[PDB]
Amino acid sequence: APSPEEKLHLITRNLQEVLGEEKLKEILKERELKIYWGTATTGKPHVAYFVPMSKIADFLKAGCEVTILFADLHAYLDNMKAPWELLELRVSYYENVIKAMLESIGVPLEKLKFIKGTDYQLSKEYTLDVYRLSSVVTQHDSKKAGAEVVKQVEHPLLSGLLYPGLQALDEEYLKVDAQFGGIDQRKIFTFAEKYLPALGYSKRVHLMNPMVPGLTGSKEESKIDLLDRKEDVKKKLKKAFCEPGNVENNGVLSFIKHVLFPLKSEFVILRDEKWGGNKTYTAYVDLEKDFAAEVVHPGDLKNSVEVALNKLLDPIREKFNTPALKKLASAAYPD
Amino acid sequence: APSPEEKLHLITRNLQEVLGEEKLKEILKERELKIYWGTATTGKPHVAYFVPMSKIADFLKAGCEVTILFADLHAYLDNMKAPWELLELRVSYYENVIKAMLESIGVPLEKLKFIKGTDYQLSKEYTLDVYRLSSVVTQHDSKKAGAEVVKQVEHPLLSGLLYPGLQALDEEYLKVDAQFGGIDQRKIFTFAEKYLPALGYSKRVHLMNPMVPGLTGSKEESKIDLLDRKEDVKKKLKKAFCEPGNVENNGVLSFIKHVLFPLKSEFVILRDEKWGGNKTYTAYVDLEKDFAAEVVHPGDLKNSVEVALNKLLDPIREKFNTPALKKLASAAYPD
Ligand SMILES: Nc1ncnc2c1c(OC(F)F)nn2[C@@H]1O[C@H](COS(=O)(=O)NC(=O)[C@@H](N)Cc2ccc(O)cc2)[C@@H](O)[C@H]1O
Numbered sequence A, B: 001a002p003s004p005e006e007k008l009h010l011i012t013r014n015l016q017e018v019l020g021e022e023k024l025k026e027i028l029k030e031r032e033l034k035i036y037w038g039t040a041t042t043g044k045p046h047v048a049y050f051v052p053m054s055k056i057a058d059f060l061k062a063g064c065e066v067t068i069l070f071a072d073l074h075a076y077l078d079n080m081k082a083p084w085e086l087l088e089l090r091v092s093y094y095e096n097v098i099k100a101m102l103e104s105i106g107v108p109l110e111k112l113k114f115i116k117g118t119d120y121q122l123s124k125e126y127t128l129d130v131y132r133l134s135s136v137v138t139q140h141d142s143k144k145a146g147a148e149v150v151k152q153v154e155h156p157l158l159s160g161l162l163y164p165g166l167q168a169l170d171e172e173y174l175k176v177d178a179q180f181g182g183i184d185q186r187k188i189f190t191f192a193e194k195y196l197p198a199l200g201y202s203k204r205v206h207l208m209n210p211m212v213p214g215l216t217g218s219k220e221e222s223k224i225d226l227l228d229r230k231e232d233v234k235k236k237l238k239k240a241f242c243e244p245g246n247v248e249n250n251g252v253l254s255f256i257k258h259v260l261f262p263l264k265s266e267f268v269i270l271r272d273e274k275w276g277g278n279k280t281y282t283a284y285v286d287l288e289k290d291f292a293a294e295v296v297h298p299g300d301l302k303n304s305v306e307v308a309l310n311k312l313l314d315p316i317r318e319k320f321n322t323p324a325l326k327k328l329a330s331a332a333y334p335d
């Protein structure tokens, strides 16, 4: 039975920014927070998705009612990042792999709600609100709201202007108090705080993670897929940006900070007896200090992350080791 | 039983431009043409609406299946020219006054179909097509398609970009072969010819009237309302631009050309015996020649139009002389 103060700590730890602290505290004084996270069903999710999933885990630990939105219409509206025929296959792939990630990090699925955008975003009342919103949002504001999220092409399409407006309306139709996403969503979040009240709807609390550098190319591609075999995880980890003593733009350290510490509350560095043997850290700042002092070597850091990451991936790889899930993976991502 | 050639003449006479003559003739060789005309339910219709209604009459004379669309959602999308609360009152006013105009010029209403946009434009299949269209139409093309139709404001709204796309989709959902409107619709019509095939839908024939100068200020406001009393019709007609011998930008002559000649097939100029007495014209070009020669005086032309216009308005004014229609007129246009 966590106190409102303990819930607030669980909910907001590791975030880059909280908008709406006043209302957030008002809610936690009385009841559970209702929050959602959305993802457009576009490319294959990679290990970076453990970063938002670790905050989802925190939200459930705090007692929140959590909704996960598979934003299939949004994937279509974002420059057809998922063509319309493949959408429902993409939703199935996303649902299976996101549930597998949550099961792997021990998140109880029975208190989560999963919904796909097209379950309600084609309804008459929602569509009427899209038109009501379109009558107050300028073309200027919808273009700028999506600048960091929607793909920016030479001749922008009308769909790209619709995208942020629907993401705002989703807060009302999912009946939430708050929306969580990475800080790349910030301009959509502030757009929603401005325009939802123009429709008679309350502004929501917005919770924003930092954009965490990947476990590969410095801060694009070459990422680690959730279904990569151990040997491919090992190979990709060797090439990760991880300079000795350099605690910035370090995707290996960032994964520890945002995924492994919240999961386990500790992190063990594997190290030879010659250099002091293993050491258990209870706080990220202590590990960071040792890495800056160069008494945690990059190779030992990578070794330690490799062991923990393969533990997270093992049940996922097992789950997708089914004839039906192998066919789904290939069918959702053909050529 | 008019021939295909006689139907084509009735359908296309007095038009400024026909797009799709090849397909138009292919259809008339086999069956009746399916056509619609739409109007956004915004301001009170004035006597200029007799110009499109006279072409509707021609279409029915040619045997066409005609739909009249009361585009209520479009009125809302066009800079809220009709706010959402007043829309259904505006639709009722438009339906009553348009049916009255057609009855006045002797158009049989029983073979016309009347539909309001929100009967189908909020449906799931239509909304899906709006999103499919938005994924191919650029912001650039939708802005330019509506440049002469949608109000151009300093900070354009998203609704204004949606407007031409929905007008294009209306051609498919109303299941027509052709759309009729004034030539101010041309950029929406060519937009529809370009983009409907991107959705797997056929291009439509487009029929365009000329933009006829009003019976008032030269070629805005001061117009004659369909419910104006005889005395107000008389007063407004006195101030109409009608210079002797000047057959251009002459709203009085244009009304004769586009409304009175199609209705009656003749036009009688009322003139004193001293100047030759009355004369009946069987063709507009003969009247124009006499006006250019200054043997039809502006006052006599206005007198002759006044008599005919009050005949067209009399049954409309009688129809709206009901307690329920008086309340409707005031409720749809308050303050
Ligand atoms: N490296 C990282 N570090 C920290 N957070 C990260 C990443 C990362 O990298 C990536 F490559 F995986 N993504 N995320 C976060 O997870 C989510 C990704 O999902 S998304 O598909 O991008 N969704 C969108 O864009 C949203 N508009 C979709 C949407 C649509 C309608 C709604 O009503 C609500 C939402 C967003 O919150 C992202 O910030």
Ligand SMILES: Nc1ncnc2c1c(OC(F)F)nn2[C@@H]1O[C@H](COS(=O)(=O)NC(=O)[C@@H](N)Cc2ccc(O)cc2)[C@@H](O)[C@H]1O
Binding pocket: B037, B038, B039, B040, B041, B042, B046, B048, B049, B051, B052, B069, B071, B074, B149, B166, B167, B168, B170, B171, B180, B181, B182, B183, B184, B185, B209, B210, B211, B212, B213, B214
């Ligand atoms: N002086 C004149 N001479 C000759 N024709 C004239 C005029 C005139 O003057 C005015 F003041 F009355 N209007 N018209 C013509 O009648 C119609 C008016 O209706 S409207 O409300 O303007 N409709 C729109 O704009 C259309 N986008 C509405 C629409 C929406 C969805 C659809 O699927 C189809 C259509 C249009 O065709 C106009 O050209």
